[PDB]
């Protein structure tokens, strides 16, 4: 039995990379060499967003492009009005060990979790005027590495137990588990339609999942080291990943392979976080060495640097209207850039 | 300032009242000793947690001579340690548990597994500055076993007696020789048993020496 199944697995691995290689008629570079460069991206820190007292681990924008949640190891989930720098809420976490946070597409909820193995869902819009824990999504057996809401009742969460899970929040219940990663899953990105998501893991692999059918559609494997960061390109047909390889990589869904890589010889450090600009033309990546690099996503030219942090950039988010990027850091600050 | 509406002014006032509570909770959090509790599965962690108190992180709180201690047992986590061990970079001291009785027990040898774990934690890039409290947790059952079975089960390289003194001291040195970075790190080893107060006093002693040495870095004397 097992030797024949292993031969058939290796034979399918030959057939699938042969099918990818048959698609590879020209590389993205050959198609974008004739396009004009971005020029220098010279963003300025327009806001510094100060009240966290430990490392920022995560942030997420609201869909309004004005509120952002952020989470730090001081056990606070802070909601910021980015325009005024006002703290809208500071939410005391039951476990300080938060590694991720998400803000619902409605702005009604924030989610967070980490080394507690729980994704806590916080209702922002109570009649009581405090923020309350509405649900605790217990059922992962390793740390919560990522959360993303699909809507007020559906959240996809990623874990150190090597699984993603989709939850029904009102039942408190993982309605789907996604199991095919062999390493700890570190990151999620929902597709723009929320029918798909990608997750990147410590087996240096990214998997595309169908949310509704509960299955891995595609696996992507060009990274030499563990994927910390993942983001859909804004069309939903491709995604970027960032890893401890000190590379980002852009992968097609439709052609099922790597298009391009984003690295410079003087970049030697793990990519913590990844985001696209609204047109997808800029790929923003956050690093240890304490900065964010902006890439021409079409050329892989390093288009600019967001050099304002004193410790590891742990987070990025571009706003949904594309106006700004917020970058979060282990130095305990969030900086907003334009 | 005239540029802010009556509601903007009340939102800035709320934001500043949130700052006042964040800053107050930071003052509370700064006076708390963060302790990361490590060691292999049966290493005596639970005996330590009982004495100190008397899946996911088990965070336990104790108070001793007005230091407040938070103990993070990361033992129930089963996941890739280099993805989350950097959460603990701001820890005061690691407490590392070793079952001293496990020199002649199987995982392939448990004492060598404890040493490989200790080496990887001790010499970690996130903990270069961070001291370690070793608890060698089962000195009674080690005295019962050492009379029956030699340390040569773990260390064929050894050449002392199967008396408690020479065997226990050799094991302590077999862990403390795993320190690289001796310029910036200290190990506070303590032989441990069924004992209510002395182990908690040892954490307080070793943590006070660690805080003094952190303060002496913060003012250039160390």
């Amino acid at each position, epitope marked *: 039995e097992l030797d024949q199944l292993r031969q058939e697995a290796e034979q399918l691995k030959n057939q699938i990379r042969d099918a990818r290689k048959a698609c590879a008629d020209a590389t993205l570079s050959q198609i974008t060499n004739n396009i004009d460069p971005v020029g220098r991206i010279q963003m300025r820190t327009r806001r510094t967003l100060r009240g966290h007292l430990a490392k920022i681990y995560a942030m997420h924008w609201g869909t309004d492009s*004005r*509120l952002l949640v952020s989470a730090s190891q001081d056990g606070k989930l802070i909601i910021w*009005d980015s*325009y*005024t720098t*006002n703290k*809208v*809420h500071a939410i005391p976490l039951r476990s300080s060990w938060v590694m991720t946070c998400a803000y619902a597409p409605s*702005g009604n909820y924030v989610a967070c979790g980490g080394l507690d193995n729980i994704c806590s869902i916080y209702n922002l*819009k109570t*009649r*009581e*005027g*405090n923020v309350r824990v509405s649900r605790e999504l217990a059922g992962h057996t390793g740390y919560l590495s990522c959360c993303r809401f699909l809507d007020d009742n559906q959240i996809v969460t990623s874990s150190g137990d090597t699984t993603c899970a989709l939850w029904d929040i009102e039942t408190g219940q993982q309605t789907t588990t996604f199991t095919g990663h062999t390493g700890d899953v570190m990151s999620l990105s929902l597709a723009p339609d929320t029918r798909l998501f990608v997750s990147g893991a410590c087996d240096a692999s990214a998997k595309l999942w169908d949310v509704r059918e509960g299955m891995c559609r595609q696996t992507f494997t060009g990274h030499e080291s563990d994927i910390n960061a993942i983001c859909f390109f804004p069309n939903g047909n491709a995604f970027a990943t960032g890893s401890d390889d000190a590379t980002c990589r852009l992968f097609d869904l439709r052609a099922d392979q790597e298009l391009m890589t984003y690295s410079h010889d003087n970049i030697i450090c793990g990519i913590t976080s990844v985001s696209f600009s609204k047109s997808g033309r800029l790929l923003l990546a956050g690093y240890d060495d304490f900065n964010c690099n902006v890439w021409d996503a079409l050329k892989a030219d390093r288009a600019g640097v967001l050099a304002g942090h004193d410790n590891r950039v742990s987070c990025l988010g571009v706003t949904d209207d594309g106006m700004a990027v917020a970058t979060g850091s282990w130095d305990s600050f969030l900086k907003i850039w334009n | 300032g005239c*540029t*802010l*509406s*009556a*509601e*903007d*002014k*009340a*939102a800035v*006032e*709320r*934001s*500043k*009242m949130i700052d*006042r509570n964040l800053r107050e909770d930071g003052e509370k959090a700064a006076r708390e000793v963060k302790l990361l509790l490590l060691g292999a599965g049966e290493s005596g962690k639970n005996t330590i947690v009982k004495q100190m108190k008397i899946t996911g992180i088990v965070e336990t709180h104790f108070t001793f001579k007005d230091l407040h201690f938070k103990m993070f047992d990361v033992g129930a986590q089963r996941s890739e340690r280099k993805k989350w061990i950097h959460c603990f970079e701001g820890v005061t001291a690691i407490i590392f548990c070793v079952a001293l009785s496990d020199y002649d027990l199987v995982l392939m040898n448990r004492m060598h597994a404890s040493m490989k774990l200790f080496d990887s934690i001790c010499n970690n890039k996130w903990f270069t500055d961070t001291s370690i409290i070793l608890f060698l947790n089962k000195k009674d059952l080690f005295e019962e076993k050492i009379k029956k079975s030699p340390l040569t089960i773990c260390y064929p390289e050894y050449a002392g007696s199967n008396t408690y003194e020479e065997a226990a001291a050799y094991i302590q040195c077999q862990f403390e020789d795993l320190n690289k970075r001796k310029d910036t790190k200290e190990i506070y080893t303590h032989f441990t048993c069924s004992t209510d107060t002395k182990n908690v006093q040892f954490v307080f002693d070793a943590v006070t020496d660690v805080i003094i040495k952190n303060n002496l870095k913060d003012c250039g004397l160390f």
Partner: single-chain antibody
Amino acid sequence: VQLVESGGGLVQPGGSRKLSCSASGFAFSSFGMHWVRQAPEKGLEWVAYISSGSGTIYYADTVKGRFTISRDDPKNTLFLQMTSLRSEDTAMYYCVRSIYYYGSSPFDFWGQGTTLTVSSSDIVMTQATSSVPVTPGESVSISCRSSKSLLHSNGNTYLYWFLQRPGQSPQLLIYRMSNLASGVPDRFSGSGSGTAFTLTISRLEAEDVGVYYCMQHLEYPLTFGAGTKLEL
């Protein structure tokens, strides 16, 4: 959520009463609190404000120095110590919640009121109407105007619309000119130019009977319209 209110009944002119308002079922310390007066058969008048954590206090000039707003967060209680009462103070006083952050709904909850019977350059809000006799099912379009533009430099327009039903305390319908409150049906909608404003009740119902007040929140003192009643 409640605001239950006591101190009231008869008092002589020159006299004094402590109004109190005990909050329950909400995070009282995080809310700013207002008192709003309503003189018998007259409109709403804002009296006093105390912010969350007492850091800001405001009064109407009709009560400034003469009334003091006080607050006991550990007792979830709000007070109005009225030190030198006059016939012009005879009213139902409503304790009112407000909370201020981006996208919040201030004035969202009003207590049942307490009645005080004293024995015997502000932004002007105008509704250019007093009563409207009308029938269920059809649309209604109440309107208001301000002496100053309520459209601020930040892009908010600070109208609030309140409905007060007969024998009941006011209820927030619309906050910040466009936005309808929690538990208010989509039948109510708000619009305006920055100086003129409309509340549309798109399909009227028998529960919509009552006095409708605009209020500005651009500047203190807060000022209400005179109120327009809808009746069957």
